[PDB]
Ligand binder design. Structure first.
Ligand SMILES: [Mg+2]
Length: 90
C-alpha cells in the first residue's frame, strides 16, 4: 500500500529521525496521542540509535492514511532529505 514507501525506507527513517522533534506536530494533527508520545519518548535511549524512531514508525503504521500523510508532512518540515527519500522527489 502507501505504507510501502515508508516501510522500504524504514532503516534510514528509524535511525535518522529524532522522534522528539516530530511528536509535537504529530500530536497537534491528532495522529498520535499523549500516551503514544510517552511510549516513544520514555523509551530507553541506547548506545545504538539504529532503531530510535522504530517505535514511532510502528505506531504511525496503525494510524491509516491520515497518519501516513501527516507523517510525510512532518518529514517535509523537519527532515527534508528523508522526505525526498520517501517520496522520490529530487
Ligand atoms: Mg503521559
Amino acid at each position: 500500500a502507501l505504507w510501502e514507501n515508508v516501510e522500504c525506507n524504514r532503516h534510514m527513517l528509524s535511525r535518522y529521525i529524532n522522534p522528539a522533534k516530530l511528536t509535537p506536530y504529530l500530536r497537534q494533527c491528532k495522529v498520535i496521542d499523549e500516551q503514544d508520545e510517552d511510549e516513544v519518548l520514555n523509551a530507553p535511549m541506547l548506545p545504538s540509535k539504529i532503531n530510535r524512531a522504530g517505535r514511532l514508525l510502528d505506531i504511525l503504521h496503525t494510524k491509516g492514511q491520515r497518519g501516513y500523510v501527516v507523517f510525510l508532512e512532518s518529514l517535509e518540515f523537519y527532515y527534508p532529505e528523508l522526505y525526498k527519500l520517501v517520496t522520490g522527489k529530487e
